[PDB]
Amino acid sequence: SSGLVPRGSHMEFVNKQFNYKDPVNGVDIAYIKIPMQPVKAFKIHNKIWVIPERDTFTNPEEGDLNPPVSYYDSTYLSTDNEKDNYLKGVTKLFERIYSTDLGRMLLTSIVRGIPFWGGSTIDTELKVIDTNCINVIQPDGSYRSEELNLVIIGPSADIIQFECKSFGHEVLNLTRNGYGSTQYIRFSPDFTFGFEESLGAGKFATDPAVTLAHELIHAGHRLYGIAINPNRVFKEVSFEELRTFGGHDAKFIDSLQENEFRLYYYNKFKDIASTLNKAKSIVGTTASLQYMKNVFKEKYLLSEDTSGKFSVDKLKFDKLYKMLTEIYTEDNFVKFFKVLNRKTYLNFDKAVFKINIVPKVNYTIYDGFNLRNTNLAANFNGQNTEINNMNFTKLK
Ligand SMILES: [Zn+2]
């Protein structure tokens, strides 16, 4: 048993207890194409899909799992049992994230963060951007385009290179102009990293719910188009990484720089407001202009006057911006999960471990590895790779 529903009747965020072999149905289990042969995918929530495959799709130069802190294994995730376990493990982590107040906030923000309809060359016309959709095949074999915000997919060649990436635009920088774009997270629930810590020094494992939450925090930044340019770095660790980690690491971003960033994205949100105001037409949908305007009023928390004209309210912008950049941090998830974690963004080890968080005897939504009323409950024993060695196989 997987313990996917420790309380209540049904999972609170993931919409179905999927099995990889469940039949396709064109709605929440479907063969899909990314904008290649279709892959079987699972819609775990409004705007969120899971592709339990190694990622040989998003990047054309990374279309092979051949090897050239990394770990390679071209056979991982090639069989149906593994894809089923992947799906259930990702499902379990979403529920673990959603069982905390902070995670319900972050995932709500993610779901509301629809990529902006900024794809038209006519600045009075709202139009989707094609690369913020997937093509979903129905049972009868037709396609329909579906907008989405987030795809979780298996890693490419380097199994432990987890990241949040997205398709770019010829001219627009969608992750930094407030528009946002569909985010693809390369991630595996089946491996984790070791760090050392003294409570002799101990050899502990990172809780994969923390790692997933980290990538989801990036996704939130990028869905609201407020990511920091990857060329801002401390010599390399990017400001974007420091901000996502949070804690004292974030305090190192000089605070005058932060105000400059905040004013920049405030102005970008104002540009979005006046695009919505100058909009006269909409293409590629049966939904009215006014309705899609309101989707984006809702996303960016725009104010609307009696005339129907949108604007950015300074207090609402600061609230949203602060949530996405200061409240949603790895360090804050560590505090909510009450797990052990590296204390600064660089202090990870070269150690990699195979794990299996699906069986509830190994890992639970409420306690992670540190199972209550067991010897793993105290001193983070469940994450200690020597004490709880039955849950960690060392690979490198
Ligand atoms: Zn990161």
UniProtKB/Swiss-Prot annotation:
Active site residues according to the UniProt entry: E215
Signal sequence interval, chain numbering: none
Subcellular location: Secreted; Host cytoplasm, Host cytosol
Residues annotated for Zn(2+) binding in this entry: H214, H218, E241
Domain comment (free text): Has protease activity.
Function comment: Has proteolytic activity. In vitro the whole toxin is reduced to release LC. After translocation into the eukaryotic host cytosol, LC hydrolyzes the 197-Gln-|-Arg-198 bond in SNAP25, blocking neurotransmitter release.
Name of the protein in question: Botulinum neurotoxin A light chain
Name of encoding gene: botA
